[PDB]
């Protein structure tokens, strides 16, 4: 209610702060993913899965 | 060169003749200009870029 930014800035913002509340304690979370090393698992993560669509789509993959 | 005259070209001042005549053929320079786009109605909403950041452009932008 108190927010006048449009629905794109917003949906990037609760990404990011989906993304960082995944920065807690237990497997499956990033820190023990990195503590192990096991950087793959973090592309697999469902979080940059739901902020996939915002990225430009014509240079996603470079 | 330029419309009006387009049957001419001028090099140095040297105006120069076309073996042929065109009243369209050289109205259309909506891709002349760019390589991967094209000219389209003014905006002034649309922001001003350089030639380097058009890479990372999108479509219908």
């Given amino acids: 209610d108190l927010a006048v930014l449009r629905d794109e800035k917003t949906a990037i913002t609760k990404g990011y702060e989906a993304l960082i509340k995944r920065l807690g304690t237990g497997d499956n979370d990033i820190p023990s993913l990195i503590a192990k090393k096991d950087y793959l698992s973090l592309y697999n993560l469902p979080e940059v899965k739901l902020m996939a669509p915002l990225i430009r789509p014509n240079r996603k993959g470079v | ?61």
């Fill in chain 2, 1 to 61: 060169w330029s419309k009006a005259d387009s049957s001419k070209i001028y090099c140095h001042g040297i105006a120069i003749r076309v073996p042929l005549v065109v009243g369209d053929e050289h109205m259309d320079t909506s891709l002349a200009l760019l390589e991967g786009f094209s000219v389209c109605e003014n905006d002034p909403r649309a922001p001003m870029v350089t030639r380097q950041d058009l890479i990372d452009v999108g479509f219908g932008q």
